[PDB]
């Protein structure tokens, strides 16, 4: 919605300053560890041929985006639940309760949760997330797509994550803090304010992906 348009114009602004062509680029002066995101996808598995795409946030909370456009999130407490239908309504259940309507989707939310815990590696394991509100519900995965060069994930709180398969690098763009986190080939990370990148620019690695990440935002809003 407005968040996707907000993100898009922030990317056009940094890409129009031509940040890599600077007499002296100082991306060392755009850091903001006070802008590290609260949640981000650190595990995911795509089984869309049968059920959908299951994931895990930085908290152990597990969510699944099913093929029928419904969603099921299991909080990192192991019990609390959240079900969101295609049309948007939310419902708050538990696993201690026995909602018969979903017992075939809870089993598959469990299968995804077991697989990710069994085989896949937690991305951003060396990052301290930033503290969130006390009684804040988790965000769900609104829309995702997966190409050959990268995968794109769009949470319900605006954050857009992009993992490049070849470089292993990862971007986490937040339109609210106006920041991006770049994860290095060596799993090193940093958070840069976006308006500061206009004034000081950045290296070729970060600059290149900010240009590519714009066309991906354009493909989320073309749909």
């Amino acid at each position: 919605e407005c968040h996707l348009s907000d993100l898009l114009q922030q990317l056009t602004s940094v890409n129009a300053s031509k940040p890599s062509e600077r007499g002296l680029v100082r991306q060392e002066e755009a850091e903001d560890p006070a802008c590290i995101p609260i949640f981000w996808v650190s595990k995911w598995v795509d089984y869309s041929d049968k059920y959908g795409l299951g994931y895990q946030l930085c908290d152990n909370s597990v969510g699944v985006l099913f093929n029928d456009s419904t969603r099921l999130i299991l909080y990192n407490d192991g019990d609390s639940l959240q079900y969101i239908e295609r049309d948007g309504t939310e419902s708050y259940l538990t696993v201690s309760s026995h909602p018969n309507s979903l017992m075939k989707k809870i089993t598959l939310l469990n299968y995804f949760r077991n697989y990710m815990s069994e085989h896949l590696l937690k991305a951003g394991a060396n990052i301290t997330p930033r503290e969130g509100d006390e009684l804040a519900r988790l965000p769900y995965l609104r829309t995702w797509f997966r190409t050959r060069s990268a995968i794109i994930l769009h949470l319900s709180n605006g954050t857009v994550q992009i993992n490049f398969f070849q470089d292993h690098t990862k971007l986490i763009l937040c339109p609210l803090m106006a920041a991006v986190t770049y994860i290095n080939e060596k799993r090193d990370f940093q958070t840069y304010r976006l308006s500061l990148l206009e004034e000081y620019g950045c290296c070729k690695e970060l600059a290149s992906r900010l240009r590519y990440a714009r066309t991906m935002v354009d493909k989320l809003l073309s749909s």
Binding site: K43, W44, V45, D46, Y47, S48, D49, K50, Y115, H119, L120, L121, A123, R146, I151, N163, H168
Partner: peptide, 8 residues
């Protein structure tokens, strides 16, 4: 099916 980065 396509999983993300395997523990390794």
């Amino acid at each position: 099916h396509y999983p993300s980065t395997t523990a390794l």
